[PDB]
Amino acid sequence: GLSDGEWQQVLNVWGKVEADIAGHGQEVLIRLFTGHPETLEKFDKFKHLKTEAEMKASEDLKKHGTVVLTALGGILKKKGHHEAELKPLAQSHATKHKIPIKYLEFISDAIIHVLHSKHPGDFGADAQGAMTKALELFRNDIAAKYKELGFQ
Numbered sequence: 001g002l003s004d005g006e007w008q009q010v011l012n013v014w015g016k017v018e019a020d021i022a023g024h025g026q027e028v029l030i031r032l033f034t035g036h037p038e039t040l041e042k043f044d045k046f047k048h049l050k051t052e053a054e055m056k057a058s059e060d061l062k063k064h065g066t067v068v069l070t071a072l073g074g075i076l077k078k079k080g081h082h083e084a085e086l087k088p089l090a091q092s093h094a095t096k097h098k099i100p101i102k103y104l105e106f107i108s109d110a111i112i113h114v115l116h117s118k119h120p121g122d123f124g125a126d127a128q129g130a131m132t133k134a135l136e137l138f139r140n141d142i143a144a145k146y147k148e149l150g151f152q
């Protein structure tokens with residue numbers, strides 16, 4: 001549950017991501033895969049990437065980064081009213097992709113990391129607080145659908 005002020009910050013920060021959605025998406029996935037290599041194993045089309053150089057050079061990884069952040073942005077722009085947007089993602093990630101909620105925690109923190117890296121001194125304390133809350137909300141609503149499905 002975010003305030004309007006907080007949502008305003010979130011969508012303000014998001015404007016940064018939208019100026020370069022592929023570059024941000026790329027760096028988030030790279031930060032995830034290198035921070036937590038077990039996550040790479042969930043992708044049959046990235047599992048071949050051994051090195052970070054190969055990750056950086058991967059146009060298909062950048063492509064998927066675009067897909068992921070496009071979906072997250074659509075959800076964020078709903079300001080919490082994202083049940084229709086979120087339900088199919090929860091279902092596919094639980095039932096088809098089999099992604100534990102721990103990995104959503106991982107990518108949440110990775111987004112925070114990337115924003116500081118790409119915008120040092122331009123991602124203030126209030127901004128981080130708002131973005132973190134928004135990602136927690138997202139995660140918590142997925143977690144509810146996971147529980148429903150009995151998925152661990």
Ligand code: HEM
Binds near residue numbers: 067068099104
């Ligand atoms: C912000 C969090 C995330 C968002 C918004 C997101 C969004 C999406 C979308 C829109 C797709 C394609 C449609 C679909 O299959 O439902 C997808 C596919 C996929 N996602 Fe996620 N995802 C997120 C996090 C993760 C994480 C943390 C993992 C694994 C560690 C993951 C694993 C996958 C895999 C394996 C696919 C299918 C890839 C393929 O073979 O095309 N996702 N995701």
